[PDB]
Design a protein around this nucleic acid. Structure first.
Ligand SMILES: [Ca+2]
Ligand SMILES: [Ca+2]
Ligand SMILES: [Ca+2]
Length: 295
DNA sequence: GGGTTTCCACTTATTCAGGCTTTTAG
DNA sequence: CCTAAAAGCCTGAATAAGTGGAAACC
């Protein structure tokens, strides 16, 4: 249908994408293992069009259901990985995921030489997989008895432009209408809240948003050993002047675009002070009920 | 063909999106 | 007093990452 700006796409990839490298026990392979290399995105059913638009932009990839409520785009046809590579050389990732892309490239090169059909190419792929995403299973690591490093170098890069940021925010942002039980006349303060969420491994990136957007602050949270960061803007002046124009100018994708649009309607109400009238409050309550999970 | 690649159904792990209420600033 | 802003709390699930099975292809 519609095609996606290449930096918007990279941003969305930084947010939602995943590189994959399968090294599979296989009785029929001359070396006892077969491989599969690729890139994939899994979204809620409601955002299938993003997947289809990505498929259209690159002209690669297979779309399929992923359980009852999700759908995926997977690219594993080896020739088509050349497209993935060319895209991310001209429009590179900036989160720690770049590290996974660099490993995907190393694995691509081994397979391009057909070395994965030989002991030494398989061994090499196990060394690559060992640093990729969640690394080797215990079964695979006991099968290749050699000291295999699990570390790679931290990525540290800057937001390259607003188009990447709109792609990334299309993945990781949220636009909240926070209805606060307040001591004022109407009894409800209306608070617009923009947030961007992301694992701590990319702290430097999340801290940069403060200066990159000239507003906001960051909260840290965890569930047991699992920590992440939350970039939040709540000052209406920053919302209206700094957040909203960025994304009016750099268009979000997916149903999150509708949420931002509803959020902007509420912004206009606030700017006109109608959030201080019972009838404006009613409309704002009705916008909220129908955005995000209520859509 | 016998190996190898590709696709499809489905699962598992966790990092997100994004819900609240109460307190302070101005 | 009054409204805006920030402090401060939370977890279900949409993501991330992955696996089993087998058809299709070279
Ligand atoms: Ca992400
Ligand atoms: Ca998302
Ligand atoms: Ca499961």
């Amino acid at each position: 249908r519609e095609s996606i700006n290449p930096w918007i796409l990279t941003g969305f990839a930084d947010a939602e994408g995943s590189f994959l490298l399968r090294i599979r026990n296989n009785n029929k392979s001359s070396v006892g293992y077969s491989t599969e290399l690729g890139f994939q995105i899994t979204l809620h059913n409601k955002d299938k069009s993003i997947l289809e638009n990505i498929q259209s932009t690159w002209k690669v990839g297979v779309i399929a259901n992923s359980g009852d409520n999700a759908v995926s785009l997977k690219v594993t046809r080896f020739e088509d990985l050349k497209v993935i590579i060319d895209h991310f050389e001209k429009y590179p990732l900036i989160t720690q995921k770049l590290g996974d892309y660099k490993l995907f490239k190393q694995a691509f090169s081994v397979m391009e030489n057909k070395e994965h059909l030989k002991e030494n190419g398989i061994k090499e792929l196990v060394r690559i997989k060992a640093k990729l995403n969640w690394g080797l299973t215990d079964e695979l690591k006991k099968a290749f008895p050699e000291n295999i490093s699990k570390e790679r170098s931290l990525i540290n890069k800057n937001i390259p432009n607003f188009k990447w940021l709109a792609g990334f925010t299309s993945g990781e942002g949220s636009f909240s209408v926070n209805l606060i039980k307040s001591k004022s006349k109407l009894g409800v303060q209306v608070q617009l809240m923009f947030r961007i969420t992301q694992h701590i491994k990319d702290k430097n990136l999340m801290n940069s948003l403060i200066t990159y957007l000239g507003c906001g602050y960051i909260n840290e949270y965890n569930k047991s050993e699992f920590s992440w960061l939350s970039f939040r803007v709540t000052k209406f002046s920053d919302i209206n002047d700094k957040i909203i124009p960025v994304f009016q100018e750099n268009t979000l994708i997916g149903v999150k675009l509708e949420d931002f649009e509803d959020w902007c309607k509420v912004a206009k109400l606030i700017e006109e002070k109608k959030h201080l009238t019972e009838s404006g409050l009613d409309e704002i309550k009705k916008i909220k009920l129908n955005m995000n999970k209520g859509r």
